[PDB]
Amino acid sequence: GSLQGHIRRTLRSIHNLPYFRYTRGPTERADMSRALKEFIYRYLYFVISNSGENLPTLFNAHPKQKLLTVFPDSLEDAVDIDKITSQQTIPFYKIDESRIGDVHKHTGRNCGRKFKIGEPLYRCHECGCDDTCVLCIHCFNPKDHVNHHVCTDICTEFTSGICDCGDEEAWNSPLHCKAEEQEDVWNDSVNIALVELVLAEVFDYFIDVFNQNIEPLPTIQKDITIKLREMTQQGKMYERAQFLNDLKYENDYKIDPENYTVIIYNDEYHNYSQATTALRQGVPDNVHIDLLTSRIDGEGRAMLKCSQDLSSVLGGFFAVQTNGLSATLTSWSEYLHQETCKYIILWITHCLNIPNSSFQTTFRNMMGKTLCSEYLNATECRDMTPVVEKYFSNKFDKNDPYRYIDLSILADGNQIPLGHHKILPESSTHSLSPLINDVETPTSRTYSNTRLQHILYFDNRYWKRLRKDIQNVIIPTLASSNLYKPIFCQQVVEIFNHITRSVAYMDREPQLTAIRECVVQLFTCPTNAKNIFENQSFLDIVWSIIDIFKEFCKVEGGVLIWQRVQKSNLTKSYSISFKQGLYTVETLLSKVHDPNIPLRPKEIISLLTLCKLFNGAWKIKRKEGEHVLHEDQNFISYLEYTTSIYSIIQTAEKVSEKSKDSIDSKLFLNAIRIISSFLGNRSLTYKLIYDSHEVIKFSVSHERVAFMNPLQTMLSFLIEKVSLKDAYEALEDCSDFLKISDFSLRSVVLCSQIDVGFWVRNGMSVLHQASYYKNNPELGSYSRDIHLNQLAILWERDDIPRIIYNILDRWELLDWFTGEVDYQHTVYEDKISFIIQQFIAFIYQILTERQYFKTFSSLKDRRMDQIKNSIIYNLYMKPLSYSKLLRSVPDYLTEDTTEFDEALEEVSVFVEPKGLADNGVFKLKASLYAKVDPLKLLNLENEFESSATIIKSHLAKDKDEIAKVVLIPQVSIKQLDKDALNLGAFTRNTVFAKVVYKLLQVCLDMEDSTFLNELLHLVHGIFRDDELINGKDSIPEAYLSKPICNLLLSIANAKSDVFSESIVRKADYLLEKMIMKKPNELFESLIASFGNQYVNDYKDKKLRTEKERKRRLAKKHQARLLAKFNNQQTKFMKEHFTCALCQDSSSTDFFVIPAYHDHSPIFRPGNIFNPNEFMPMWDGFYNDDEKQAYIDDDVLEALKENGSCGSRKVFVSCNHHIHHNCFKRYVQKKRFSSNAFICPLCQTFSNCTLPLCQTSKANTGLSLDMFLESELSLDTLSRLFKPFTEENYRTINSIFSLMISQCQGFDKAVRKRANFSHKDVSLILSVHWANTISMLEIASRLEKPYSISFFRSREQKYKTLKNILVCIMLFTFVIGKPSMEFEPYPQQPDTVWNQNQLFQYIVRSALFSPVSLRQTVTEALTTFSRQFLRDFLQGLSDAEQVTKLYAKASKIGDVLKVSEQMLFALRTISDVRMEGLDSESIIYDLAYTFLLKSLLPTIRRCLVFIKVLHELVKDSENETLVINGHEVEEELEFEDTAEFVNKALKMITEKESLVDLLTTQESIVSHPYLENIPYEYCGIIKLIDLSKYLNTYVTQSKEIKLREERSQHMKNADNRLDFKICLTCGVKVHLRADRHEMTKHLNKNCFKPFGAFLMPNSSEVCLHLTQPPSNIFISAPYLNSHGEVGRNAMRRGDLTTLNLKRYEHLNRLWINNEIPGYISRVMGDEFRVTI
C-alpha cells in the first residue's frame, strides 16, 4: 500500500536533504559515503522486515558494543541523519563473528555458494559431466569417489564461480551432499509480498536512474565533450545550461546551474603514469592528485573536483582531451543517486549472506521473480531518446532500423532496441557461397523487455566495482535458481546480439563484460543448450559471432578470408570479442542433445560459414636471399583462432561418438557435397608436362602456402564417417578431387620442406608454425591430409599416372625426374637427399596406414586403438615417466584420462623406481615391438635408422644379430573396406616403378645412403602389399620390365664400405624373396647386364662374418701398438695429507678443517611414567599414521630453547684439510665473511673451523686397555702428539686466539660469565663434543640393528669426532687445563642446561679427571640409577594406577621380569609402602624396564666414546675394535635388552653385572653435573607421523585434527587450504599470502635455525635455513599411484601413498644437521649472493 509510495519518496529525495545538498571535499566524501551506506542499509532492512519488527529473527538481538538501540524505533528513526552522523546508532546488520559456519541445507536446488579466495575446488575428472562442474567444501563427500582423479584447485582472485551440488544433470553419477550424510515468519504470504514489493521498487529505481545515465557511454561521450566545448567558446551559455539540465537526472517527486562535478572513468588505454599526468594537468589545486586520485580509479571511478560554480570546474573538466580518459560532467544529485544505487547493490549482496535459510530461500526467489518479470513503469519513467534525438540528430538517422542500438540507447517508449538480427532463408542454404551466404534482416522483434534485460543492456554505463557487484549478485543467484534458470537463459539469449555488439564496438572496459559469466553459468547445461537448439536462437548466436568476424574479412583468390586486426584497437575489444564468440560456439556445440542438430542444413551452413573465414587464412612465402631481420609475430592470432575452430571440430566429433544414437547418412552426404563443391570452386593454374598429362602449376618455394585448412579436415572427417562409395556418390559430378586434395598435399610438402631446414632464411616463427602443424594439440591435421591424399589416389582409377606426376610435381622433383635438370642442381641444392627421404616417407605413409578405411566394432575401440598406437610409438625409444608420456601424446587423446590409463596399462608394464628421487617409468612390452613400423606417420619426429636399430636390438636374440635382422613393414587388410584394398595401384604402376629405379640408380651413382634404408623399406612394403592383394608368390610386373634386381644386386655385392650392413642385409633379403617367388623369369634379367659368371658364382656365394677378418686385424694392430708402447716405456725407464694450493710442499702449516657449528632440535626431555616414551622397543625407523601429528607444551618449549640456548650446539664437518694461509687467501680473494662461508671442496656451508694436529702413536704403548683400567687423563693421550717448535707453538697460540675471538659458535652466556678466561674453552668444547656424540647415537637409533647401529656407516662422523677430539686436546695441551675452577653451566635449581648431563659428566670425568674410565662410568651410572629409582618409586598418580599402567605397557610391549636377587637389590636401593597388592613385583618390573630403557642411551654413547678412543689409538687401518679379548660387533650383534645391558656393563664398567653394580655402596661425590640429573627423551627421535595418503591433508582437512598456529588464525582459516605443515613440530602454518609467505614460524613457536615444511597441494617439502634468507624445494616423500613424485604427482588428483624409505632418508638428513649443508649444496653458485 503506502509502503511503495513511502519508499519512492524517501529514495527520490536523498539530495533534498540539507546534509548532502552542498558539495564537499574529498575527505568529506568518505564520511558522507559511510553515512549513505548506513542509512540505506538501515532503511532497507527496516522496510524489508514486516513493519520493522522482524529484524531479531535475522540479526543478533544483543550484539557487542551495546552500551543507542540495536534496531530502529520506526520509519523516521531509520531515515534520520542526525543520529547517523552523531555516531549514536550501531551497525546491527554486521554478522562478522565466529558463529558463521555457512550452514546451508539444500535439497535439489543448487548450492550456488560463491568461492572466496583460497577455497578449494574439487573438480572430479570422472563424475563431472564436463570440466566446469566444481564442488565446494561443505558439498564434497569423499566417500563417493574412492579411486577417482580429483583435481583439487585453490580459488584465486580471477577465479569466480559457484558450487554445483544437487545438479543432477551436471554429474554423471548421483552424489550425496556432506550435510545430508549427517513458527516460520518468512513463508507467509504477507512477508513474501512485502519483500517482493521492496525488491521491485529497488530495481525500478536502479533501472530508472541508470536509464538516464548516457553521459559515460563510449559512443556519445566524445560529442558530449565536443558540444560542451562548442558552447564554451562560442559563448552561448543558455543552451549549454539547457543541455546540462536535459542530461541531468530528473524525477517527479544566475542562469547557469550549480552543484556540479567532474568524474573520470577507469580504462585500459593508459597505465598509472599517463593517468597521473592527465590528472596533474587537469586541476593543480587537487592536493596529491597524482597519488590519492590515481588509486581510486583502480577500483571503478573517482571524482577529482566538485564546486557550485560551473565556470571553475569546466576549465578543469577539459582534461578529457589531454589523455583521452572518459571523463564526464555530472550533477551532484545524479552522483548522489548513483552512489545510492551502488550502496543498494551492496545491500542486496549483503542480504544474500544472512544465515536464515528461510529468509534466503524467500529473498532469492522474489528477487529472481522481480528480475524476470516484465518491466513495467517504462511509460512513466523519463524517455531519454528525445534528448539524444534533438541534440545529436546528425548521428541519429531516422530511417535506419538500427539507429538506436548503434548508440546503446533504448527505443521510444523505453523498449529494447532492434539488434542486428540475421536469419538466413532456406532458399539460400542449398550451396555455400564463396562470400558470406545471403541472409535477410528482419525489421521487427518482440522482446520480453524485462528488468534483467535492461540491467544487462546497461552494462556499458556502469563502473568496474558496480559492474562486478551486479554480476556477482545476479548471475549466481539466477543461475543457481532451478526455477528461474531456463527463464534466465531465454532472457539473456533474446538479448545476446545486443550484448555481443556492445562488448565488441561500444564498451570502455570490455573485459568486465557479463556475457562471459552468463555463458559459463548458463550455456554449460544440457537443458539450456537443448532448449536453445530446439529454437533458432542458436543460429542467431552463430550469426552474431559471424557478423562480428566479417568486419575484418578480406577477399583473396575468389574466397572470403579473415585478416589480422590492423585498425586502432587501443581498447583491445576485438580480441575479447573473438575469444568470447568462439568459446560460446564451442560450448554450445559441446552440449548438443541430438548429434544431428549441428548437421542440419541451416546449422551446418552457418557453422561452415563461421569456419570458412579461417580456411587457409594464413600464408607464408619462402624468404630467399637475406635472412629476415625480425621474426614474424602475426601468426599468433591465426594460431589461436584456428585452434579454436579445430577444437570445435573435435568437440563435434566427440559428441557424435559419445551420443548413443547415430547420424542419418543423408546429412553426411549433404555436408560432403557442400564442402566439396565450395572447395572445387577454387581457381588453380594448370600445366601440361607430356601431351596428355595435366597437373597444377604451383611452386611451394616461391608462392604462398597455408598450414591449417579446417575445411579439408572437416571433409576428411565426413568422408570417414560414411562408406567410400557413398562418399564418392555425394561428390559433385562436375568436380576434380585433385582440386580439393592438392591443398592438403601442399601442407604436407611444406611441412617436409621446412623439416629439412630449407626455410632457415625465414625466422624461427615458421619453424614454430611447422612444429605446431605436426602433432597439433587439438586435431590430427597431418593425418587428415594424408587421408585426403589417399582418397585422391584411390578415386582416380582412370588416370593413375596423372596422380603420380602431380604428387611428385609439388615436391619440385619433376624437373629431376623427367631429366630436365640434373640430380645435383635441383632447386633444393645439396638438401635434395633429405627431401627425397621425406618424399619416400610420405609415399610409405600413403601406402601403409589404412586406419581411416577400417571398420571397428565401436568408436570406443577406434579411440582405444589410436591411444595404443600413440603410446607405442612414444614409448619404444626409451622407458618414460607418466608426466613425459602425457607431454608427448597429443592433447586431444589424453583428455579421457580413464581410457588413457587403461590403454597405458594394457600396452606397457610398470617399472618400479629404484633410487630415492626418481619417477616410476613405463617399459613397452617386448611382444609389442613386432608392431612398430619405424616409417609410419606416428614416428615422424624421429629419424629412420635410429628407430630401426632400436627395434632390431629389442628384437635380436643376441648382440650378434643387431644388424642381421629385417623389419617387416606394417601393412595389412584386416577389417578393411572393400573399396580401400586398391591403394597399391599407384605403387604397381609403371611410372612409379621408373621413379623407384631412377632413385636407386642415382643412389648407386652418387653413393649417398641418406635415403637408402627408407627406399628399401618402401620396396619391401610394396612387395608385401602386392602379396597381400594378389596372393602367394606374386610380384609386380612393373619392376620386372624395368630391371631393378640389377640395382639391388649392385647394392648387395658392394665393398661393404659404401653401404652399411643393414642396407646390404636388407637388399639381399629383397633379392632372395623375389627370386624365390620366380627364379626363371628373374635369373634372365641378371645375366642380361651383369654377365653369366656373376650369377653362377652368386649361388656359390650363397649358402657359403666379413668383419671377423676386420676384427682380427684390428686386434693384431692393437697388440702391435701396445707392444710398441711397452717397449717405449721400458726404454724410457732404462734411460732414467693433501693441500689445496701447496701440493707436495709438505709444509708445516696447520690444516684447518671447515665445520658447521649450530644448535640442533633433537634434544628434548622425556617425562617419566610415560609408556609411549620408554616401553616400546625400537626396530629401526617406523611411522604410525593412526596418530595425528601433535606436540606437547614442554616439548615445544624444549625446541624453542634448543633454537635459542647455546648449550645445545653441535659440530659437524666435511673433513677437508686446508692450509691456514690458503684458507686466508680463499677468504680474502672470494670475500666471504670469516663468520660464515662455504667449503672450497664440497661447497658446503661452514661457519667455524678447528685445526688438526699431526697425531702419531710412535714411541708409545697406548691402547684401550689402560684407558679402561687406568687413568684417561687428557695428557696421557696428548703424549701421542709430536714435539712442537717455538714458531709452531706461537702460531698455535695465535690461531687458537683468533678462532676464539672471531667465532660466534661459542655461547655468549659463558662468554659474559664471571672468571671466564681462554683456559675455559675446553669445557664448552667437550660439551659440544658430547652433544655431537649424542646426535650420533640419536641418528643411530633409526637403524634396524640398534645394538651395533652406531658402529656401521658412520666413517665420516667418526672422522669428525676424531678431529674434534684432537683439536680440543691440542688446545688444552698448548694453553693448559683450567683445573675445573669455573663452571660454564651452573646447576641452577630451576633450569636444565643440557638434556644429556649424565654423559656430560662422564666426558668431564674421563677427559679431565685423571682417573679410570671404568670407575667413572660406574659412578655416573650408579648415581643416575639411584636418582631415577627414587623418582619412579616415590612418584605419584600410580599407587592405585600401577595396574592400569602395567596393562598399558603390556599393550605396548613386554615388561621384563625381575628375579629374586634383583627384587632384593631394588628393595634395598629403595622400597615403598604403597604396595597394596598380594604380589608387588609389578612396580619392581616397571622400574626395571624404565631404568634399563632410560640408561640405554648413556650406555650406547659410552660405547661410542670407546669406539672413538680406539680409532684414535688404532694400530692399522683395518683393525677391528676388541675389548677384553672379544669383538664388540660379534658380542653385541644378537644381544637384546637386559642381556645387552649386562654385556655392555661387562665391556665398559669395572663391575660385572647390573646386580653387582647395584650392590656397590652409595659413594657420594659433589660433581656439579651429578645433582638432580635431568631425564632425556627415550623413544625414537624423528619428524612427525605423516598420513598414509597425502590426499587426507587436502581432501579431508575438515576431518583430520591437527594443532594450529594462532598467528593470523582468522578470515575463514577453518576452511582454507593454503597451509603448510611443520614436520619438526606438527604445527600447521597457514599461508595468508602476506608477510613473506609466513616464514615467521621459524622466528618463534618452533626451532629457529632450520625446519622442513610440507606442502600437500604441490606434494613437495621445503627446507629453510634461517641464517641466510635461503630455502629450497624438494619432492615430498610421497609416491603417486602412477609412479610420479613432485608437483606432477598431485596434479590430476591421483592417490598419493607414502614411501617409507624416502621419508627415512629425509629424517636422516634432518637429524644429522645436514639440512643446512644440503641447502647450501643445492644452490651452488646461487648461495654466494647471500654472503
Contact residues for other proteins (CB under 8 A)? 626-631, 757, 760-761, 763, 830, 834, 914-916, 918, 943, 945-946, 1009-1010, 1057, 1060, 1111, 1113-1115, 1117-1118, 1121-1122, 1125, 1128-1129, 1131-1133, 1135-1136, 1138, 1140, 1143-1144, 1214-1216, 1240-1244, 1353, 1355-1356, 1721
Which residues, listed in sequence order, are joined to residue 554 by a DSSP beta bridge?
561
Q: Is 1217 annotated as a binding residue?
A: no
Residue 1205 in contact with residue 1301, Cβ under 8 Å? no
Q: Is 136 in the site for Zn ion (CB under 5 A)?
A: yes
- 3-state SS assignment for residue 827: coil
8 Å CB contact between 764 and 699: no
Shortest distance in whole angstroms from residue 944 CB to other proteins? 8
| Residue 148 engages Zn ion in binding (rule: CB under 5 A) | yes
Grid cell listed for 1463: 627384587
* Binding to Zn ion, residues 1228-1287 (CB under 5 A): 1239, 1241-1242
Nearest distance in Å: CB 628, other proteins = 7
Q: Dihedral through CA 459, CA 464, CA 470, CA 472, nearest 10?
A: 130
Residue placing its CB nearer to Zn ion in the complex, 115 or 773:
115
Distance CA 859, CA 844 (A): 26
Q: Is 111 in the site for Zn ion (CB under 5 A)?
A: yes
Cell of 1673: 624445494
Q: Pick the closer one to Zn ion by CB: 124 or 1049.
A: 124
As given in the structure block, the three cell numbers for residue 1152 are 684447518
**1622 annotated to bind ligand:** yes
901 is in an annotated binding site: yes
Please identify, using beta-carbon distances, which residue of 1310 and 1711 lies nearer to other proteins: 1711
Nearer to other proteins, 691 or 1144 (CB): 1144
Q: Is 111 annotated as a binding residue?
A: yes
Q: Which is nearer to Zn ion, 806 or 1696 (CB)?
A: 1696
Name the strand (E) or helix (H) holding 560: strand 559-562
Which of residues 168 and 912 has its CB atom nearest to other proteins in the complex? 912
Integer angstrom CA distances of residue 1146 from 364, 1140, 1151: 90, 12, 11
Is 177 part of any known ligand binding site? yes
What would you report as the CA-atom Rg of the chain, rounded to the nearest whole angstrom?
A: 44
- 1144 is in the binding site of which of Zn ion, other proteins, none (Cβ under 5 to 8 A by kind)? other proteins
Residue 888 CB, nearest distance to other proteins (Å)? 16
Q: Please count the CA atoms within 13 angstroms of the CA of 710 that sit on its side-chain side.
A: 25
| Nearest residue (CB) to other proteins, 75 versus 1140 | 1140
826 in helix, strand or coil?
Answer: coil
Counting beta carbons within 10 angstroms of the beta carbon of residue 477, is it exposed (0 to 12), middle (13 to 18) or buried (19 or more)? Answer: buried
All three cell numbers of 393, joined, read: 540528430
Question: C-beta of 626: minimal distance to other proteins in Å?
Answer: 6
124 binds, among other proteins, Zn ion, none (CB under 5 to 8 A by kind): Zn ion
The smaller minimum CB distance to other proteins, of residues 322 and 1060, is found at 1060
Handedness of CA 1347, 1352, 1356, 1362 (dihedral sign): positive
Least separation in angstroms between CB 1541 and other proteins: 30
* 3-class state of residue 1361 by DSSP: helix
Rounded to whole angstroms, the Cα distance separating 654 from 891 reads 14
Pick what 943 binds: other proteins, Zn ion, none; C-beta below 5 to 8 Å, kind-dependent: other proteins
**CA–CA separation, 1036 vs 953, rounded Å?**
32
User: Judged by CB under 5 A, does residue 1139 bind Zn ion?
Assistant: yes
Cα separations in angstroms, 1214 against 1149, 1225, 1244, 1727: 20, 20, 8, 18
Cβ closest to Zn ion, residue 1310 vs residue 1654: 1654
Q: Residue for cell digits 587421408?
A: 787
Please choose which of other proteins, Zn ion, none residue 1729 contacts, taking the beta carbon within 5 to 8 angstroms, the exact cut-off set by kind: none
Q: Is 1142 in the site for Zn ion (CB under 5 A)?
A: yes
Q: Least distance (Å) from other proteins to the CB of residue 762?
A: 10
By a kind-dependent CB cut-off of 5 to 8 A, residue 127 interacts, out of Zn ion, other proteins, none, with: Zn ion
* Partner whose binding site includes residue 1139, from Zn ion, other proteins, none (CB under 5 to 8 Å by kind): Zn ion
Asked whether residue 1142 is marked as a ligand-binding residue, the answer is yes
Q: Which does 1077 bind (CB under 5 to 8 A by kind): other proteins, Zn ion, none?
A: none
Phi, psi of 137 (to 5 degrees): -65, -50
Q: Is 127 in the site for Zn ion (CB under 5 A)?
A: yes
The answer to whether 136 is a known ligand-binding residue is yes
Residue 1248 counted as an annotated binding residue: no
State the Cα–Cα distance between residues 276 and 1112, nearest whole angstrom: 86
Q: Does the annotation flag 1216 for ligand binding?
A: yes
Residue holding cell 643393414? 1062
Q: For residue 622, state whether it binds Zn ion (rule: CB under 5 A).
A: no
Distance CA(151)–CA(257), nearest Å, equals 61
Measure CA 153 to chain center: 10
Selection from Zn ion, other proteins, none that 221 binds (CB < 5 to 8 A by kind) is none
Q: Give the Cβ contact number of residue 362 at 10 Å.
A: 20
751 is in an annotated binding site: no
Which of Zn ion, other proteins, none is residue 629 near (CB under 5 to 8 Å by kind)? Answer: other proteins
Distances (CA, A) of 837 to 489, 655, 742, 1306, 1487: 57, 39, 21, 74, 86
Beta bridge partners of 1629: 1620
Which residue, among 1368, 1151, 1399, has the nearest Cα to 1278 in the 3D structure? Answer: 1368
We find the least distance from the C-beta atom of residue 761 to other proteins, in angstroms, to be 8
Cβ closest to other proteins, residue 938 vs residue 1621: 938
All three cell numbers of 168: 543432477
Residues of this chain, 1480-1509, that bind Zn ion according to CB under 5 A: none
- Nearest CA to 779 among 605, 644, 588? 644
Spatial distance between the Cα atoms of 1099 and 1264, rounded to a whole number of angstroms? 85
| Site map (CB under 5 A) of Zn ion, residues 1184-1223, x = contact | ------------------------------x-x--x--x-
Residue 1625 C-beta: closest distance to Zn ion, Å: 4
Phi/psi zone of residue 102: left (φ > 0), alpha (ψ -120 to 50 degrees), beta? Answer: left
> How far is residue 1710's CA from residue 1713's CA, in Å, rounded to a whole number?
5
- Map the footprint of Zn ion across residues 1680-1709, applying CB under 5 A: 1694
- Give the shortest CB-1077-to-other proteins separation in angstroms: 31
Q: How far is the CB of 1364 from other proteins (least distance, A)?
A: 16
Helix axes 737-755 and 665-680, enclosed angle (nearest 10): 70
What's the rounded Cα separation, in Å, for the pair 829 and 819?
16
Instruction: In angstroms, give the least distance from the CB of 627 to other proteins.
Output: 5
C-beta closer to other proteins: residue 943 or 1097: 943
When the beta carbons of 135 and 228 are compared against Zn ion, the nearer one is: 135
**Interaction partner, residue 1113 (Zn ion, other proteins, none; CB < 5-8 Å by kind):** other proteins
Nearer to other proteins by Cβ, of 630 and 1099: the residue is: 630
User: Would you put residue 584 in left (φ > 0), alpha (ψ -120 to 50) or beta?
Assistant: alpha
Secondary structure E strands in 754-876: none
Which residue's CB is nearer to other proteins, number 1080 or number 1143?
1143
Instruction: Find which of other proteins, Zn ion, none residue 956 binds, CB within 5 to 8 Å per kind.
Output: none
CB atoms within 10 A of CB 679: 23
Q: Cell 615403598: give the residue.
A: 1472
Give binding residues for Zn(2+) as ranges.
Answer: 106, 111, 124, 127, 136, 139, 145, 148-149, 163, 165, 177, 901, 1139, 1142, 1214, 1216, 1219, 1222, 1239, 1242, 1622, 1625, 1641, 1646, 1682, 1694
Give binding residues as ranges.
Answer: 106, 111, 124, 127, 136, 139, 145, 148-149, 163, 165, 177, 901, 1139, 1142, 1214, 1216, 1219, 1222, 1239, 1242, 1622, 1625, 1641, 1646, 1682, 1694
